[PDB]
Each structure stands twice: as C-alpha cells, then as structure tokens.
Amino acid sequence: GVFTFEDEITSTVPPAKLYNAMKDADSITPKIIDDVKSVEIVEGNGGPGTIKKLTIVEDGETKFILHKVESIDEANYAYNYSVVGGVALPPTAEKITFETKLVEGPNGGSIGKLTLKYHTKGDAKPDEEELKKGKAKGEGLFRAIEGYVLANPTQY
C-alpha cells in the first residue's frame, strides 16, 4: 500500500531562491546537518534518475543511504527524491518518497507543500515511528536549505 502525508510549510524566502538552493542541496546539507557527512553521486548527472549515496551517522554508527532523484520541475518549484536503498530504508518500506512544492506567498515569501509517501509491499503497514522520522527529515532538509539562504543573502 501507499501511505502519504502532506503538510503545509511557510518561509520568508521567495520560491525561486529556495528552489535554486534546493538544487545545490548536495553541497549545502553536509555543512548544516551534523549527521549528514557527505553526499556522493553514484550514477547520473544530477537530474531525474540520478542515484546518490549519503554518508550519515546515527548514534555514533556510520550508515549509507541511497537516494534517487525523481523530478526537478522549475514550473512547480519542485524537488522530489526517493529513498531506494541502504539502512535508512526501513524493513517495512519498499520506497520512501519526499516531495517539495512551492508557490509564491502573499508577502514575498513562500508557501510550501511537503509530502512524504511511504510504499509498502501489499498489506504490510508502515512502522509508525517511520512516519515521524520521515516527516522530521523532510522538514529538516527544507529548514536547512532555508537557513542557508537566509544566512547567505547574496548567494541566491
């Protein structure tokens, strides 16, 4: 089955800036997110279908997570990717997709939608702690990218 949660988020940063910075997430995130050590391209040019390998530390334990880029759409200010492999993928999960979509806000900022989609095989239910952790990671990445833009106003 597929279990989805969609949450609304806001930022004072306008969406083109946020989108541009999301495209540089591979170099922004390891600096900001202490548990993300590095991001390496396994295959591809950075667009849809690119597989990336993230080196993480969780509780003193080094782990590898594989992400597949799903879509990068300027028109929706969208940056979507999937967890496709590694320990970050729970035993119950076939795939976890993270989607971000932005629109212009009323005050020159952004209104965002963050979507977490958790695919399971057949009637298997997801681990509920996984929804929580997935929600927080999606929001954590968005806040990282936002934080970097706010702290570096001439970069974007």
The CATH fold assigned to 1-156 is Alpha-D-Glucose-1,6-Bisphosphate; Chain A, domain 4 (3.30.530)
Q: What are phi and psi of 82, to 5 degrees?
A: -120, 145
Residue 46 DSSP code = S
d(CA 79, CA 146): 14
Q: Which residue from 15, 8, 3 is spatially nearest to 156, judged by alpha carbons?
A: 15
End-to-end CA distance of the chain: 40
Count, residues in the chain: 156
Please name the residues in contact with 117: beta carbons below 8 A apart, sequence gap of 6 or more: 2, 3, 4, 96, 97, 99
Resolution in A: 2.1
**Buried/exposed 102-122: b ≥16 CB within 10 Å, e otherwise:** beebeeebbebebebbbbbee
d(CA 86, CA 106): 41
DSSP-derived 3-state class of residue 117: strand
**Residue 150: its H or E element:** helix 128-151
d(CA 74, CA 15): 10
- Method by which the coordinates were obtained: X-ray
CA-CA-CA-CA torsion sign (85, 89, 91, 95): negative
Query: Is residue 65 within 8 Å of residue 51, measured between CB atoms?
Result: no
Long-range contacts of 140-143 (CB under 8 A, 24+ apart): 140/33, 141/25, 141/29, 141/33, 141/98, 142/9, 142/11, 142/100, 142/112, 142/114
Secondary-structure percent of the chain, ordered helix, strand, coil, rounded to 5: 25, 45, 30
